[PDB]
Design a protein around this ligand. Structure first.
Ligand SMILES: CCCCCCCCCCCCCCCCCC(=O)OC[C@H](COP(=O)([O-])OCC(O)COP(=O)([O-])OC[C@@H](COC(=O)CCCCCCCCCCCCCCCCC)OC(=O)CCCCCCCCCCCCCCCCC)OC(=O)CCCCCCCCCCCCCCCCC
Ligand SMILES: CCCCCCCCCCCCCCCCCC(=O)OC[C@H](COP(=O)([O-])OCC[N+](C)(C)C)OC(=O)CCCCCCCCCCCCCCCCC
Ligand SMILES: CCCCCCCCCCCCCCCCCC(=O)OC[C@H](COP(=O)(O)OCCN)OC(=O)CCCCCCCCCCCCCCCCC
Ligand SMILES: CCCCCCCCCCCCCCCCCC(=O)OC[C@H](COP(=O)(O)OCCN)OC(=O)CCCCCCCCCCCCCCCCC
Ligand SMILES: CCCCCCCCCCCCCCCCCC(=O)OC[C@H](COP(=O)(O)OCCN)OC(=O)CCCCCCCCCCCCCCCCC
Ligand SMILES: CCCCCCCCCCCCCCCCCC(=O)OC[C@H](COP(=O)(O)OCCN)OC(=O)CCCCCCCCCCCCCCCCC
Ligand SMILES: CCCCCCCCCCCCO[C@@H]1O[C@H](CO)[C@@H](O[C@H]2O[C@H](CO)[C@@H](O)[C@H](O)[C@H]2O)[C@H](O)[C@H]1O
Ligand SMILES: CCCCCCCCCCCCO[C@@H]1O[C@H](CO)[C@@H](O[C@H]2O[C@H](CO)[C@@H](O)[C@H](O)[C@H]2O)[C@H](O)[C@H]1O
Ligand SMILES: N=C(N)NC(=N)NCCc1ccc(I)c(Cl)c1
Ligand code: SF4
Lengths: 307, 154, 70, 174, 69, 83, 100
C-alpha cells in the first residue's frame, strides 16, 4: 500500500515537471506577444513528450572521475524527490515531527551535485563555474534558514502540518510579509532562477542533461509549494480533504507561474551584485526581523503551543 | 517485425523533428532575418524550435552569414562537438557559396567546404519566412529517415 | 538645439526621501514592471499561422529569377 | 534482521572510516566521510536523537563538509587520483577492512567478543529504556534548555564564533 | 490567445492534485476509513500500542467502545 | 537634537535598509520591557501541565490545598479563559 | 520503515533513470591550486560560521516554552546581536567586497 503511495507521488512529480516546461514556454511567449509551442499536439500538449523522447535518444556525449560523473545526477534527482515526502497536501506521505528541519537538512545537501559535477567536468573553467554557483547557493541558504526560524516562532514546532493549524484563521503572509518578500526572492536565488540565473548567464559569456533539468524543475515546484504552506496556509477540512488539495494546488501553481512571470520581466544581476543583495541587504534585515519575531510572541503573550 | 520497425521509426522521427534545437552561427546580416524568425510574427518556438540552444544541446547548426577563412576552423570545431543526430542549414548566398564575396581572398566559397549541409536557403538575405520554409523542409527530411528499417535489414 | 537626458536633482525634503525609501524597500518600480508584462500576457499575439498564413509582400518583391516570353 | 539495525549501521560506519583514513585522494576521502556522516546520523536517529541526527546532516554534512569539498576543489585536488591505485592506500584499506570483518564475524557467531575489551553481542536493543509515555521529546527539552540553564554556555560559544570570524580574517589577509 | 495557455496549466494542476488526493484516500483505506493516527510523542505511541492490544485483531485503528465493557 | 534629526534624514536617504534593520532591532530589544502583556507569557507557560501533578499526603494542616480538582482551592485559570 | 522505503525508492529510481539515459541503442557499426581566489574561500568560511550560529538558534521555538523567559529572551537576542556584530566586522573590514 505504501509503495503505491510513493509511486502516486513520484510519477505525478515528473509529469508535472514535464508540463511545466510547456507552461513556461507558453507563458513567456504570450508575455512576449507570441504563442510558444502550439503545433506539436493541440496547444502544444505533446511538446514535452517530443522533447523528452528526443533528449533520451540523443548521442550521450571524457570525465575526470566516472564515479562522481554519475553520482552528481543521481544525487540531484534523488534529493529532489525526497524533499516531497514530508509535504502535507494535506496529509504527508511521511509525517515527521521535525519535517521542517528535514527539508532544511536535505536541501543543504543539494549543493553537492553542483560540486561533484564541477569536479567531474575535467575542465578548469567548469570547476570555477561550479564553485561560483556553490557560493551563491550557500549564501542564500543563510537567509532561508533564518527566515524559516522566524516564521516557526509563530507556529511553535518543526512539524509542517502545524503550519496549517497556525494559519487556520489567517495567512502568515499578513504578520510576516517582510519575511515573505525575502523568502520568495531567496528561493529564486537558491534555484538559480532569473534574475539570479548566473550559471546559464555567465556560462555563455541528452539523458544526463535531462536528469539535471528534471531535478531543478522539481525543486522549483517544491519551493513554491513550500512557500504556499509557509505563508498562504490553506484550511483543512478533515471530512473533505480534496477541498484542501484543490485550493493548495491553485496557490502553488500561481506561485510557480510567478517565477516565470519574473523571468520575463527583469535583467540579470551581476555576481557581485547578487552577493551584496544577500550579505548587505537581506541578511541585515533578516537578522533584525529574527530578533523582532523572537520578542513579539513574548511581548504580546502570543507564544504558540509546543505541540 | 516490419510493422514495429516502421512505427518505431515514425516515433523517433516525430520526436526529433518536433524538437529541433538550433545552434545559430550568426555570422553576418543573415543573422538578422534569423532573429526576425524568432520574433513574434513567426515565433519559431511555436514549432518546438527553441530560440537559442547550447551547442552541446543542439540538433541543427544554422550558418547565417559569411564564413571567412579566419572563422572556418572555429565553425568546424563547433560542428564536431555537436551530438548526433546533427544537421546543418546553410542560410543565404554567403554561406551557400560565397555570394557577393565569392571572389574574395578571405572568404570560404560556401560553408559546405567545411561541414556537410542538409538544407540550402537562398536569398541575400532569405526572408524570415524563407528561412522558416527551410526549417520545415528539414523537418520533412527528418520525417523521411528510416534508420531502424535499414538497421533491421543489415 | 539639445536637451539633457539625465540632469535632475532629487528633492531632499522628507516626503521625497520617504518616497524613495518606500520604493527601495517595497520594490514599487519592480512591481510596476510586472504590470507591463502582465498586460502583454492578455494582448492578442502578433504571430501568424505559417504556412497557412503568409507575411504581406508587395509587387516590387525580389525573389526567384525567371526568363519571360512575349 | 532489523533488530540489529544499529549494529549494521555501526559496521558501515567503520568501513567508511577505513575509507578516508587510508587517505586516498581527498576528493574520495571527502566522499567516505560524507557516507560515514550519514550513517552516523542514522545510528543517532535510532537512539531517539531526532534533532541531533538532523544536525549532523544540516551542519556536519551540509555545512562543514560542503566547505571541505569547496576548499578541496579550490586549493588541494581538482582531479582525483584513481581510487586505491596507490599501494599504501590499498594495503591500509584492505588491512582495516579485514580487521572489521573478523570483529563482526566473531561477535555475531558468539554474541560477544573480546577485542582488547569485552563487548556484548546480543544487540543494542537490549539496553533500551522500557518506559516512555511523555507528551514531549526529551532530547528537545534538553536542547531547548540551552537558553534557560546554559547562559554561560551561550556566552562563551557565541563569543568564540565571533572570534572565529575575526581570527580567520586576520589569518587570510596576509 | 492567452487562454490557450490553460490546457498545459490544467495538466500540470491535475498532476499536482494526484499526490495529495492519493495519500488521503490511501490513508482512509488503510485505517478503517479514518485519518491515519499521528504519534509524534511517546504518549501517543503508547496509546496507539495499547489500542493495538485492545483491538483484539492487532490493528490500532479498530476501536472498541462500551460494547467491550 | 537638530544634529540628530539631520543624521537620521541622511541615513534614511542613503541607507534605508540599514535604518530599518536598526529600528526593528531596537524595537525588539526595548518593547518587551514596555509591554503590559509580557507578564502573561510567563504565566501561560507556567500554567501548561507537562507532567503529572503528584498529590500531597494530607496531614490535616493544608487548608489551601484542594482535596478534589473541582474544589475552590488552588490556582485558577479564569484569567486565562478571559484572555 | 516507511522513510527508508521512500529514500530507497527515490534514489533507486534516480539510479535507473541515469542507467537508461547512458545506454540506449545507437544503430552505428563504426591537484595544484585552482587559480585560487581568496574571496570565494572567505564566502564559504563565512557561510560556515554563520551556519553554526544558526544551529544554535534552531532550538528557539522550543526555548520560548520555558518559564525562564527573562533569561531566554536575553540570550536569544544576545546571540543574534553577536551574529550582527560578526557581519558588521566583516563589512567594515572590506570582507564583503568583490573588487581587487
Ligand atoms: C585497530 C587500530 C586501527 C587499525 C587501522 C586499520 C587500517 C585502517 C586505516 C587506518 C589508517 C592507516 C593510515 C596508513 C597511512 O596512510 O600511512 C601512509 C604511510 C606513508 O604514506 P606514503 O607517503 O604513501 O609513503 C609510503 C611509505 O611510507 C614509503 O614512504 P618513504 O618515502 O618513507 O619510503 C621509505 C620507507 C622505508 O620503509 C622502511 O624502511 C620500513 C621497514 C621497517 C622494518 C621493521 O618509509 C617507510 O616505510 C615509513 C614507515 C617506516 C615504519 C615506521 C615504524 C612503524 O605509509 C605506510 O606506512 C603504510 C602503512 C599502512 C599500515 C597500516 C597499519 C595500521 C596499524 C596501526 C597500528 C595499530 C595496531 C593496533
Ligand atoms: C510515449 C508515446 C508518445 C506517442 C507520441 C505520439 C505523437 C502523435 C503524433 O504523431 O502527432 C500527430 C502527427 C501529426 O502529423 P505532422 O507531424 O506531419 O503534422 C502535420 C500538421 N502540421 C502541418 C501543422 C505540422 O502525425 C504524424 O506526423 C505521423 C507520424 C506519427 C508519429 C507517431 C508514431 C507513433
Ligand atoms: C505583486 C506581485 C508579486 C507576484 C507574487 C506571486 C503571487 C501569487 C500568489 C498566489 C496566491 C493567490 C491566492 C489564490 C487563491 C486560490 C483560491 C483559494 O484558495 O481561495 C481560498 C481563500 C480563503 O481560503 P483559505 O486559503 O483556506 O484561507 C483560510 C486560512 N487557512 O480565498 C482568499 O482569497
Ligand atoms: C524607519 C526609519 C525611520 C527614520 C527614523 C529612524 C530612526 C531610528 C533608527 C536609527 C538607526 C540608525 C542607524 C543607521 C546606521 C547606518 C550607518 C551607515 O550608513 O552605514 C553605511 C556604510 C556602508 O555603506 P557602503 O556601501 O560600504 O559605503 C558607501 C559607499 N557607497 O557603513 C557600513 O559599513 C554599514 C554598517 C556596518 C554594517 C552593520 C550592519 C547592521 C547589522 C546587521 C543587523 C542589523 C542590526 C541588528 C539586527
Ligand atoms: C511596529 C513594529 C514593526 C516592526 C517590523 C517592521 C518591518 C516592516 C517594515 C520594513 C519593510 C521591510 C521590507 C523587506 C523587504 C526587503 C527590502 C530589500 O531588501 O530591498 C532592498 C534591495 C536592494 O535595494 P537596492 O536599490 O539595490 O540598494 C539598496 C542598498 N544599496 O532590493 C531588493 O531586494 C530587490 C529585489 C530584487 C529581486 C527582483 C525580483 C522580485 C520582484 C517581484 C517581487 C514580488 C514581491 C514578492 C512577494 C512574495 C509573495 C510570497
Ligand atoms: C542524502 C541521502 C538521504 C539521507 C536521508 C537522511 C535520513 C534522515 C531521516 C531523519 C528524519 C526523521 O527524523 O524522521 C525519520 C524517523 C524518525 O521520525 P520522527 O518523526 O522525526 O521521530 C519519531 C516519530 N515521532 O527516523 C527513522 O525512520 C530512522 C531511519 C534510520 C535509518 C537512516 C539511515 C540513513 C543513512 C543515509 C546514508
Ligand atoms: C523515453 C523513451 C524513448 C523510447 C524511444 C525508443 C527508440 C529506440 C531507437 C533509437 C534509435 C536512435 O537512432 C540513433 O540515435 C543515435 C544517438 O547517438 C545517433 O547517433 C549514433 O549514430 C552516429 C552515426 O550515425 C554515431 O556517429 C554516433 O556516435 C551514435 O551516437 C544515430 O544517428 C541515430 O540513428
Ligand atoms: C551585545 C549584548 C546584547 C544583549 C542584549 C540583551 C537585550 C535584552 C532586552 C530585554 C531583556 C528583558 O526583556 C523583558 O523585560 C521585562 C521587564 O519587565 C521582563 O518582565 C516581564 O516578563 C516577566 C516574566 O519573566 C514578568 O514577571 C514581568 O511582570 C514582565 O514585566 C521580561 O521577562 C523580559 O522578557
Ligand atoms: N526552459 C524551457 N521551459 N523550455 C525547454 N526547452 N526546456 C527544456 C526541455 C525539456 C527538458 C527535459 C524534459 I523531461 C522535457 Cl519534457 C523538456
Ligand atoms: S547572404 Fe546577404 S544578407 Fe546573408 S550574410 Fe551574405 S550579404 Fe549578408
Amino acid at each position: 500500500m505504501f509503495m503505491i503511495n510513493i509511486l502516486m507521488l513520484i510519477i505525478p512529480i515528473l509529469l508535472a515537471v514535464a508540463f511545466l516546461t510547456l507552461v513556461e514556454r507558453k507563458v513567456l511567449g504570450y508575455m512576449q506577444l507570441r504563442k510558444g509551442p502550439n503545433v506539436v499536439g493541440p496547444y502544444g500538449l505533446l511538446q514535452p513528450i517530443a522533447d523528452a523522447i528526443k533528449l533520451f535518444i540523443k548521442e550521450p556525449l571524457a570525465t575526470s572521475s566516472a564515479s562522481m560523473f554519475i553520482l552528481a545526477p543521481i544525487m540531484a534527482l534523488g534529493l529532489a524527490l525526497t524533499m516531497w515526502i514530508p509535504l502535507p497536501m494535506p496529509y504527508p506521505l511521511i509525517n515527521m515531527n521535525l519535517g521542517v528541519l528535514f527539508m532544511l537538512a536535505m536541501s543543504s545537501l543539494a549543493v553537492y551535485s553542483i560540486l561533484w559535477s564541477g569536479w567531474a567536468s575535467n575542465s578548469k573553467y567548469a570547476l570555477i563555474g561550479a564553485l561560483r554557483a556553490v557560493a551563491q547557493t550557500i549564501s542564500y541558504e543563510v537567509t532561508l534558514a533564518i527566515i524559516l526560524l522566524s516564521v516557526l516562532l509563530m507556529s511553535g514546532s518543526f512539524t509542517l502540518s502545524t503550519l496549517i493549524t497556525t494559519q487556520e484563521q489567517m495567512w502568515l503572509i499578513l504578520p510576516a510579509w517582510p519575511l515573505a518578500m525575502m523568502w520568495f526572492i531567496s528561493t529564486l536565488a537558491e534555484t538559480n532562477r532569473a534574475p539570479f540565473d548566473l550559471t546559464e548567464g555567465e556560462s555563455e559569456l541528452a539523458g544526463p542533461f535531462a536528469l539535471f533539468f528534471m531535478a531543478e524543475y522539481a525543486n522549483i515546484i517544491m519551493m513554491n509549494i513550500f512557500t504556499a504552506i509557509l505563508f498562504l496556509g490553506t484550511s483543512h477540512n478533515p471530512h473533505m480533504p480534496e477541498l484542501y488539495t484543490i485550493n493548495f494546488t491553485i496557490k502553488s501553481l500561481l506561485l510557480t507561474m510567478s517565477f516565470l512571470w519574473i523571468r520575463a520581466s527583469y535583467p540579470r544581476f551581476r555576481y557581485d551584485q547578487l552577493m551584496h543583495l544577500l550579505w548587505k541587504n537581506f541578511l541585515p534585515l533578516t537578522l533584525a526581523l529574527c530578533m523582532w519575531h523572537v520578542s513579539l510572541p513574548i511581548l504580546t503573550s502570543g507564544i504558540p503551543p509546543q505541540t | 517485425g516490419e510493422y514495429v520497425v516502421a512505427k518505431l521509426d515514425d516515433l523517433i522521427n516525430w520526436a526529433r523533428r518536433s524538437s529541433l534545437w538550433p545552434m545559430t552561427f550568426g555570422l553576418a546580416c543573415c543573422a538578422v532575418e534569423m532573429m526576425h524568425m524568432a520574433a513574434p510574427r513567426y515565433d519559431m518556438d511555436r514549432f518546438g524550435v527553441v530560440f537559442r540552444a547550447s551547442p552541446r544541446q543542439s540538433d541543427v547548426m544554422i550558418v547565417a552569414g559569411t564564413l571567412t577563412n579566419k572563422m572556418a576552423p572555429a565553425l568546424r570545431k563547433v560542428y564536431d562537438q555537436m551530438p548526433e543526430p546533427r544537421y546543418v542549414v546553410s542560410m543565404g548566398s554567403c554561406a551557400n557559396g560565397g555570394g557577393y564575396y565569392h571572389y574574395s581572398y578571405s572568404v570560404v566559397r560556401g560553408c559546405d567546404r567545411i561541414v556537410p549541409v542538409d538544407i540550402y536557403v537562398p536569398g541575400c538575405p532569405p526572408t524570415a519566412e524563407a528561412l522558416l520554409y527551410g526549417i520545415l523542409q528539414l523537418q520533412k527530411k527528418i520525417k523521411r529517415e528510416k534508420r531502424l528499417r535499414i538497421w533491421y535489414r543489415r | 538645439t539639445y536637451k539633457y537626458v539625465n540632469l535632475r536633482e532629487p528633492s531632499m525634503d522628507m516626503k521625497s526621501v520617504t518616497d524613495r525609501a518606500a520604493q527601495t524597500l517595497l520594490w514599487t518600480e519592480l512591481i510596476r514592471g510586472l504590470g507591463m508584462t502582465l498586460s502583454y500576457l492578455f494582448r492578442e499575439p502578433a504571430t501568424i499561422n505559417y504556412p497557412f498564413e503568409k507575411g504581406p509582400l508587395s509587387p516590387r518583391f525580389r525573389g526567384e529569377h525567371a526568363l519571360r516570353r512575349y | 534482521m532489523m533488530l540489529y539495525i544499529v549494529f549494521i549501521l555501526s559496521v558501515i560506519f567503520v568501513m567508511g572510516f577505513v575509507g578516508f583514513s587510508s587517505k586516498p585522494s581527498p576528493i574520495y576521502g571527502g566522499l567516505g566521510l560524507i557516507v560515514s556522516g550519514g550513517v552516523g546520523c542514522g545510528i543517532v536517529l535510532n537512539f531517539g536523537g531526532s534533532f541531533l541526527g538532523l544536525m549532523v546532516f544540516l551542519i556536519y554534512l551540509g555545512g562543514m563538509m560542503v566547505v571541505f569539498g569547496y576548499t578541496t576543489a579550490m586549493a588541494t585536488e581538482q582531479y582525483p587520483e584513481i581510487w586505491l591505485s596507490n599501494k599504501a592506500v590499498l594495503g591500509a584499506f584492505v588491512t582495516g577492512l579485514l580487521m572489521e570483518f573478523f570483529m563482526v564475524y566473531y561477535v555475531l557467531k558468539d554474541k560477544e567478543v573480546e577485542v582488547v575489551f569485552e563487548f556484548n553481542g546480543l544487540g543494542d536493543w537490549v539496553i533500551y529504556d522500557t518506559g516512555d509515555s511523555g507528551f514531549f521529546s526529551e532530547e528537545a527539552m534538553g536542547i531547548a534548555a540551552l537558553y534557560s540553564y546554559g547562559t554561560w554556555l551561550v556566552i562563551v560559544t557565541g563569543w568564540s564564533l565571533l572570534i572565529g570570524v575575526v581570527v580567520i580574517m586576520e589569518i587570510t589577509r596576509g | 490567445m492567452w487562454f490557450e495557455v490553460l490546457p498545459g496549466i490544467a495538466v500540470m494542476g491535475v498532476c499536482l492534485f494526484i499526490p495529495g488526493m492519493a495519500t488521503a484516500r490511501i490513508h482512509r483505506f488503510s485505517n478503517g476509513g479514518k485519518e491515519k493516527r499521528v504519534a509524534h510523542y511517546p504518549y501517543q505511541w503508547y496509546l496507539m500500542e495499547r489500542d493495538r492490544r485492545v483491538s483484539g485483531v492487532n490493528r490500532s485503528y479498530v476501536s472498541k467502545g462500551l460494547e467491550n465493557i | 537634537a537638530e544634529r540628530v534629526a539631520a543624521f537620521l534624514k541622511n541615513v534614511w536617504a542613503k541607507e534605508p535598509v540599514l535604518v530599518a534593520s536598526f529600528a526593528i532591532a531596537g524595537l525588539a530589544v526595548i518593547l518587551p520591557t514596555l509591554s503590559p502583556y509580557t507578564k502573561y507569557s510567563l504565566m501561560i507557560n507556567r500554567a501548561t501541565p507537562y507532567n503529572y501533578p503528584v498529590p500531597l499526603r494530607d496531614d490535616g494542616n493544608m487548608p489551601d490545598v484542594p482535596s478534589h480538582p473541582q474544589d475552590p482551592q488552588g490556582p485558577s485559570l479564569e484569567w486565562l479563559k478571559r484572555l | 520503515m516507511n522513510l527508508m522505503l521512500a529514500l530507497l525508492t527515490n534514489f533507486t529510481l534516480a539510479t535507473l533513470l541515469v542507467i537508461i539515459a547512458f545506454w540506449l541503442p545507437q544503430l552505428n557499426v563504426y591537484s595544484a591550486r585552482l587559480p585560487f581566489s581568496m574571496k570565494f574561500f572567505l564566502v564559504a568560511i563565512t557561510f560556515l560560521l554563520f551556519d553554526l550560529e544558526i544551529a544554535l538558534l534552531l532550538p528557539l521555538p522550543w526555548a520560548s516554552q520555558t518559564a525562564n523567559l527573562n533569561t531566554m529572551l536575553t540570550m536569544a537576542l544576545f546571540l543574534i546581536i553577536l551574529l550582527a556584530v560578526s557581519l558588521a566586522y566583516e563589512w567594515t573590514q572590506k570582507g564583503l567586497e568583490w573588487t581587487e
